[PDB]
């Protein structure tokens, strides 16, 4: 019967299309009067309108470029499809999918941003033979490898350097019996070269300097190595790695006012022909936001190589910089190589899309579908991948009213990857009949008939539905006892023509429906994340609820465990709600009295090794339990650092095993390979044999 389309718009095709995506307009002039022109398409077919007259716009995502995803990196395509055309109706939605795939053998670019303060003089003696040892351990993951070098200390200004005695301006270590190099801010040394014999032959020439205050000017270099891409040597089709080794806190913006410099960092390239930051002593430090923006634009991955003193500070920093990874570095970089390799492994085991240049009228909600088919609503990222794994997200796009401009473009892309999907949105807010509309005068009014589509819209300031009556007609209320037009309108010529309000415009057949009466959080209706659609908030695709609070994004309810609110709870409204008894914490990461790890998850020596039991027909045998089966033989540690347990296996043989943790977490087995290990039925057998022998006798 009655629907949303019939009770709002019959006057114009444009408003009928705009009311709801499920409506459609028939412009057949042979349709007898008295039938709803705007209704459902199925009802329109039941209405016996002309199928040619029916115009039902359909929102669709026409794939334009669909080059297959490349398998190796020897062109390489990692996001498919790479170009989509959308035609969204007013307040409509339509989904599409990206197929991200990390491709092996992808070329790798390495830039080494080493600090050169006096506290890091011991460090220069360990990097003296990197590169070649980086080449030998990167040839197992990449064929095309290029490396580069950099340096930084701090700003050459009075509160940070020594400017007295006069001989200490060229040797800031005058008091001690050393010859340090003059203080500098950035002295980029090597361009990215495929050859690896220069990273070895140029670090044999650097020296150290000496500032005064412990923090070092680190953020001045992550702004000039990122931006001056024509001198760094960044390739357009490689993996960009920015290794950042430091030994102390770092100066951020507004720290320069202690020296006089008060000019904000513009963020452009200031490295000249001498390979030096020329504007170091005249421009401030860059804030975090500028660094994140410039790193994101140039597709650069930043790897921290900090020490134990400052690892907490830099770990707490890296949460604000997407696409980064911290790593505990020794006091003399004895473990920089393995740190780089493991950071490369960790950055390639996560796919995180980032919409760029998103129109103000569009909202995007995702639904990750990673290894196996575990769809996790809300999340637009996932971990646990290896090099070669394909992921398939599922994006939802909604437009809040047809915008004025009808061609916009954004670009969903995984971080650190040149490849991206470019969306060509084409909003459709047009109707066929009103396009070919001419003034058919004398149809209504005194020679003032309006355009086609069966409506002679009377001129403003003139009274009359079809220009019929000015002052002196039918009932204009749903009920006889109810007030006419719900007291917010006037019923002239038998049609509720209603007021104009500064708050908004009143809509409806009787316009008893309001467009600004929706609930509000603080100052604005629908919490600022939705539009008031006839008294009921229609929140964006990202948000849901009665109010438009309660986001559906589950990025907040995410932990390193890899499950929503861990495996002991559930997430609602962007917050982690603890369900398991005794559980608490920021994201339900703390449920104590609970049965230990070496209590329940022991069937991995039953489903995986010596396969038996459940998870034999259910594809979750190894998704959760992925412990590495290692067989040590009776260390003198019969339970100090972990929880060894024993159960009688399928053959009732006691198996003393141990699995828990060795250093902050270890899915590593410490199991020994070699384990250590009835009258009635007996009598009944005995008797029969006795009788069986009895027959023999």
């Amino acid at each position: 019967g009655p629907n949303i389309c019939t009770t709002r718009g019959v006057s114009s095709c444009q408003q009928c299309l705009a009311v709801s995506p499920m409506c459609a307009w028939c412009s057949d002039e042979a349709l007898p009067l008295g039938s709803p022109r705007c209704d459902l398409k199925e009802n329109l077919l039941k209405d016996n309108c002309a199928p040619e007259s029916i115009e039902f716009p359909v929102s669709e995502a026409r794939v334009l470029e669909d080059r297959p995803l490349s398998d190796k990196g020897s062109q390489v395509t990692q996001v498919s499809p790479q170009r989509i055309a959308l035609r969204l109706r007013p307040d409509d939605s339509k989904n599409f999918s990206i197929q991200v795939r990390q491709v092996e053998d992808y070329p790798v670019d390495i830039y080494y941003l080493m600090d050169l303060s006096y506290s890091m003089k011991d460090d220069l003696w360990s990097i003296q033979n990197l590169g070649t040892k980086l080449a030998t351990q990167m040839r197992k993951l990449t064929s095309n490898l290029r490396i580069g070098f950099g340096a930084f200390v701090d700003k050459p200004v009075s509160p940070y350097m020594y400017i007295s005695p006069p001989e200490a301006l060229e040797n800031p270590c005058y008091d001690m019996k050393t010859t340090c190099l003059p203080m500098f801010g950035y002295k980029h040394v090597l361009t990215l070269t495929d050859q690896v014999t220069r990273f070895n032959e140029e670090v044999k020439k650097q020296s150290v300097s000496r500032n005064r205050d412990a923090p070092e000017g680190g953020f001045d270099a992550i702004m000039q190595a990122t931006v001056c891409d024509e001198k760094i040597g960044w390739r357009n089709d490689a993996s960009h790695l920015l290794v950042f080794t430091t030994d102390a806190k770092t100066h951020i913006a507004l720290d320069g006012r202690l020296a006089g410099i008060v000019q904000p960092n513009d963020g452009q390239c200031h490295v000249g022909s001498d390979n030096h930051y020329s504007a170091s002593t005249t421009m401030d430090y860059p804030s975090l936001g500028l660094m994140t923006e410039k790193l994101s634009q140039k597709n650069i991955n930043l790897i921290f190589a900090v020490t134990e003193n400052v690892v907490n500070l830099y770990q707490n920093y890296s949460e604000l910089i997407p696409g980064t990874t911290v790593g505990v570095l020794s006091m003399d970089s004895s473990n920089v190589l393995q740190l780089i390799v493991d950071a490369y492994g960790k950055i390639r085991s996560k796919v995180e899309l980032e919409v760029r240049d998103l129109p103000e009228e569009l909202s995007l909600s995702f639904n990750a579908t990673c290894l196996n088919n575990e769809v996790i609503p809300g999340l637009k990222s996932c971990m646990g991948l290896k090099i070669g794994d394909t992921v398939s997200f599922s994006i939802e796009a909604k437009v809040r009213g047809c915008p004025q401009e009808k061609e916009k473009s954004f670009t969903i892309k995984p971080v650190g990857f040149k490849d991206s999907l470019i969306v060509q949105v084409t909003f459709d807010c047009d109707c066929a009949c009103q396009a070919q509309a001419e003034p058919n005068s004398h149809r209504c009014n005194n020679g003032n008939g309006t355009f086609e589509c069966g409506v002679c819209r009377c001129g403003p300031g003139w009274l009359g539905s079809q220009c019929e009556c000015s002052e002196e007609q039918d009932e204009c209320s749903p009920r006889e006892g109810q007030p006419v037009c719900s007291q917010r309108g006037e019923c002239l010529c038998g049609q509720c023509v209603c007021h104009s309000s500064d708050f908004g415009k009143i809509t409806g057949k009787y316009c008893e429906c309001d467009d600004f009466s929706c609930v509000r959080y603080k100052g604005e209706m629908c919490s600022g994340h939705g539009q008031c659609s006839c008294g009921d908030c229609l929140c964006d695709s990202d948000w849901t609820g009665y109010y438009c609070n309660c986001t559906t994004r589950t990025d907040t309810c995410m932990s390193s465990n890899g499950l929503l609110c861990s495996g002991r709870g559930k997430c609602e409204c962007g917050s982690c709600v603890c369900i398991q008894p005794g559980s608490y914490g920021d994201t339900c990461e703390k449920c104590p009295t609970c049965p230990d790890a070496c209590t329940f998850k022991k069937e991995c020596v039953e489903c995986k090794k010596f396969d038996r039991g459940a998870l034999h027909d259910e594809n979750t045998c190894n998704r959760y339990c992925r412990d590495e089966i290692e067989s040590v033989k009776e260390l003198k540690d019969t339970g100090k650092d972990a929880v060894n347990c024993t159960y009688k296996n399928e053959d009732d043989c006691v198996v003393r095993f141990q699995y828990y943790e060795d250093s902050s977490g270890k899915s590593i087995l410490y199991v020994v390979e070699e384990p250590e290990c009835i009258l009635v039925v007996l009598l009944s057998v005995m008797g029969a044999i006795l009788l069986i022998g009895l027959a023999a006798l």
């Binding site: 509160p159 951020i252 913006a253 975090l288 994140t292 954004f410 006419v484 104590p592 009295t593 209590t599």
Partner: protein, 939 residues
């Protein structure tokens, strides 16, 4: 909100001189308030940038400033073997130009000092200075607090203790009304920072001309120790003074440390002896919390509140994960010495890299409303990235989250408009405090002269109903009787220093909704629906009331008898004449609307006599103190009499509760129209009910109100509920006073499990067994005096099959088990439990436990191998037991339960030994024996 932006006074300065880095007012002896504008890098005598101070007087046009002369000549003396030097070059003289009643205290934060004894040196460091000037001849007294004469070897050998070399002791400065001068110094004590104070009279009388190193007699310096949280915190980046303790004579400082505790930041409140009273940490890392503080009393309660800026705050956006807007925090002073709560209001910027809140300046009362206002600046904000200054107005609950005015930057890009602000001092004797902003990019100062405020108060007294049957007036120029009715409009205007020739336009609209040819009410005089008569209220403090007369048209002209007749009024200032420049700013209830309606079905009286009967009930009666309780109220309103014109429901909400939603019981509008009115002494919500109710109209309301936290509410809260109507006779219902009694609770949930839980054992320390009875306090409020009484098995003796060791709690426990555990020390189911085995009454006690708090009791163990070694073929089972209670709780009444419950943490032990049973896996061996025997028989 008046800051007039059309006509500005621009003070210019030399090219290349930043001229606006810092500002301050100076009130001389003979009035005549001038402007002191600091100007760093303003060249100097020998073509080197040493800054300068310009004493600009006040003039309408604005121009180049005279300049105040300070000595800049690189002084040098030889006290002894010392060679005390000061280097006046690249000093920001003018970076802070604070003033007193007669003294100008312009400071140079970057001035060098270098004593030279033989070959050893004390090294050039930016000590700073503060040149004290005085008009009326005056003297060039200088006050550098931390000018030292200690060599470098002493500092290095003492591990940099009391290292006042890098004070930069001009960075911030305020002069207390007593006469003291406290100077910030972020780099003092090796970049921890300090605060140095000396009386103005003492430094004036202690100066000797040419004397460089002299110690003021009555000075003091803040102390700083080796707390690692304080390292490189720049404590002293911005200072302020206020009154917080309550003792007026005593004075208390406010100091910001933008990089306190690893780039987190903080703001501390001190005492005149440099003793901490509080500390407010930032919300986000690298947000620069405390870059600029400002002490003002926004909410008009007599206690000085606080505002702290975080220019580099990063927020979350749609397509940007983290976006750099900026934030400002407002802290309201609580009654008594109570701890400062959460930030009462959070103001965030909108433009990327806007650095919102990098300069906060109290503004006095711009509107003269009794609530002090503030101005917050975004140097690089605005749509074009040029600059902006936002004015916020204080109110009872604090500030307003919406900026009341936005001032754009007349200067081009890169001007840093709004970098420094000042206010709360009248400059033109207009009675209104003004505001002077600075833009060191363009080397100019913009003076915004606040315009007078006119507070307009408008009413409209009209009859509640019009009867067209009665005819008491006639139409002009004719003898046609009409049904006239009276209109009474009163327009008021009260203001401080308003022009004596004030004019206003009063626009009257009758039957506003209906069209021009459909109007029902017509003015008698002009016979036009809408009129406008000028108001000449100049010099009239009391509101002036004017009355007119309107009538109802003929019956045949209109066909509606139910739609209400709506009248509206609008008082607006006349438009500016040739020259623009509006005289005053109008603010208040500039427009009002009133409704009227023709009489209908009111019976013989011709007035619709209402009979309102309101009955109310409240569900969810138990209110919890300090909890976000939600109250659902059900009221049934039914009118027994004639029509209730503009019926309405009045809920007298307390200052804590807040209106959240509604729901009717008759389709129509289950969600009901409710507006909260704050004009009353308390908060009263205005939930609509219907205009009008018919006879015997019964309407049910579902009223859900979120009751806020009210500590002073008391044992019970009375809710005042009433029905409000505009009728002449009996316009209200019976007042229903709903007393809501208020009460408390503690809910600890205990569990336990062993490590491991299940255990197969064998056929100097054994395995541990933990009964982790954790005090998971689900109770609403804090608890104090929580004492437990547990009964464990075994008396901790060598004879049992276990060795119950010590425990690891979290707080002040001291149960000595009976008898004590670790009598030594160390580091079939046989049920070893209290019921079967001996019992040990273990009693450990705790005191506090805020809502949600927890902690517990962890049992460490190592099993006694021999004792249990008994029962050669039995597999033992270990059981525990536990009890607990409460002595008291810090509540009015904790009348629910002294927490009690029993659990049993089991450690099941199994026997992994077994023999050989099923006649199966040897039942081919028997047959083989049989075959051997058969073959033997055959042979």
């Amino acid at each position: 909100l008046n800051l007039d932006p059309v006509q500005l006074t621009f003070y210019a300065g030399p090219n290349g001189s930043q001229f606006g880095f810092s500002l301050d007012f100076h009130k001389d002896s003979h009035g005549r308030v001038a402007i002191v504008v600091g100007a760093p890098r303003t060249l100097g005598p020998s073509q080197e940038e040493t800054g300068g101070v310009f004493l600009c007087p006040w003039r309408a046009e604005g121009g180049q400033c005279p300049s105040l002369l300070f000595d800049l000549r690189d002084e040098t003396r030889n006290v002894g073997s010392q060679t005390l030097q000061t280097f006046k070059a690249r000093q920001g003289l003018g970076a802070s130009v604070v003033s007193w009643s007669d003294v100008i205290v312009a400071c140079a934060p970057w001035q060098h000092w270098n004593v030279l004894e033989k070959t050893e040196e004390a090294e050039k460091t930016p000590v700073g200075s503060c040149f004290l000037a005085q008009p009326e001849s005056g003297r060039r007294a200088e006050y550098s607090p931390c000018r030292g004469n200690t060599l470098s070897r002493i500092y290095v050998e003492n591990d940099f203790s009391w290292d006042k070399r890098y004070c930069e002791a001009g960075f911030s400065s305020v002069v207390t009304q007593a006469g003291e001068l406290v100077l910030g110094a972020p780099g003092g004590y090796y970049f921890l920072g300090l605060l140095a104070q000396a009386p103005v009279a003492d430094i004036f009388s202690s100066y000797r001309p040419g004397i460089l190193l002299w110690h003021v007699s009555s000075q003091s310096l803040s102390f700083d120790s080796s707390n690692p949280e304080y390292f490189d915190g720049y404590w002293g980046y911005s200072v302020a003074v206020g009154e917080f303790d309550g003792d007026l004579n005593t004075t208390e400082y406010v100091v910001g440390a933008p990089t306190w505790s690893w780039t987190l930041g903080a703001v501390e409140i001190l005492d005149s002896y440099y003793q901490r009273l509080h500390r407010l940490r930032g919300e986000q890392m690298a947000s620069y919390f405390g870059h600029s503080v400002a002490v003002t009393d926004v909410n008009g309660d007599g206690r000085h509140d606080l505002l702290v800026g975080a220019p580099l705050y990063m927020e979350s956006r749609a397509d940007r994960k983290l976006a750099e807007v900026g934030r400002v925090y407002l802290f309201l002073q609580p009654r008594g010495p109570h701890a400062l709560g959460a930030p009462s209001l959070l103001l965030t910027g909108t433009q990327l890299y806007g650095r919102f809140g990098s300069a906060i300046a109290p503004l006095g009362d711009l509107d003269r409303d009794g609530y002090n206002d503030i101005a917050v600046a975004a140097p690089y904000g605005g749509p074009s990235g040029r600059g902006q200054v936002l004015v916020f107005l204080g109110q009872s609950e604090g500030l307003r989250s919406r900026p009341s005015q936005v001032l754009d930057s007349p200067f081009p890009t890169g001007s840093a408009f709004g970098f420094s602000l000042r206010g709360a001092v009248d400059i033109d004797d207009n009675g209104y405090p003004d505001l002077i902003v600075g833009a060191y990019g363009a080397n100019q100062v913009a003076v915004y002269r606040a315009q007078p405020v006119v507070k307009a108060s408008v009413q409209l007294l009209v009859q509640d109903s019009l009867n067209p049957a009665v005819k008491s007036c006639v139409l002009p120029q004719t003898k046609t009787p009409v049904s006239c009715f009276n209109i009474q409009m009163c327009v008021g205007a009260t203001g401080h220093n308003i022009p004596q020739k004030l004019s206003l336009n009063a626009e009257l609209q009758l039957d506003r909704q209906k069209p021009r040819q459909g109007r029902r009410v017509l003015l008698l005089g002009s016979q036009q629906a809408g009129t406008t008569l000028n108001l000449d209220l100049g010099g009239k403090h009391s509101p002036i009331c004017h009355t007119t007369m309107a009538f109802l048209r003929d019956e045949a002209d209109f066909r509606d008898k139910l739609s209400p007749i709506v009248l509206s009024l609008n008082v607006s200032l006349p438009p500016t004449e040739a020259g623009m420049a509006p005289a005053v700013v109008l603010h208040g209830d500039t427009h009002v609307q009133e409704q009227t309606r023709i009489v209908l079905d009111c019976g013989e009286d011709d007035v619709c006599v209402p009979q309102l009967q309101l009955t109310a009930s409240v569900t969810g009666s138990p209110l919890l103190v300090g909890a976000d309780n939600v109250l659902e109220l059900q009221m049934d309103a039914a009118n027994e009499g004639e029509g209730a014109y503009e019926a309405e429901l009045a809920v007298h909400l307390p200052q804590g509760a807040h209106y959240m939603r509604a729901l009717s019981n008759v389709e129509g509008f289950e969600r009901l129209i409710c507006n909260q009115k704050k004009e009353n002494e308390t908060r009263v919500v205005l939930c609509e009910l219907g205009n009008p109710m018919k006879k015997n109209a019964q309407i049910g309301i579902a009223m859900l109100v979120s009751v806020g936290n009210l500590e002073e509410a008391g044992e019970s809260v009375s809710f005042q509920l009433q029905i409000r109507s505009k009728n002449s006779q009996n316009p209200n219902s019976k007042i229903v006073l709903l007393d809501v009694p208020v009460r408390a609770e503690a809910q600890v949930e205990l569990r336990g499990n062993s490590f491991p839980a299940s255990l197969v054992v064998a056929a100097s320390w054994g395995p541990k067994v933990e009964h982790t009875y954790e005090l998971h306090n689900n109770g609403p409020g804090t608890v104090n005096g929580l004492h437990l009484s547990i009964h464990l098995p075994g008396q901790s003796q060598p004879s049992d099959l276990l060795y119950i060791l010590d425990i690891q709690p979290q707080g002040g426990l001291q149960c000595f088990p009976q008898p004590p555990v670790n009598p030594l020390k160390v580091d079939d189911p046989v049920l070893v439990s209290c019921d079967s085995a001996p019992c040990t009454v273990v009693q450990c006690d705790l005191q506090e436990m805020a809502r949600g708090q927890r902690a517990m009791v962890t049992v460490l163990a190592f099993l006694w191998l021999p004792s249990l070694y008994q029962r050669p073929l039995d597999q033992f089972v270990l059981q525990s037991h536990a009890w607990f209670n409460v002595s008291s709780l810090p509540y009015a009444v904790p009348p629910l339960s002294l927490p009690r419950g029993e659990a049993q943490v089991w450690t099941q032990l199994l026997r992994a030994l077994e023999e050989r049973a099923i006649p199966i896996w040897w039942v081919l061996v028997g047959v083989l024996g049989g075959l051997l025997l058969l073959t033997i028989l055959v042979l």
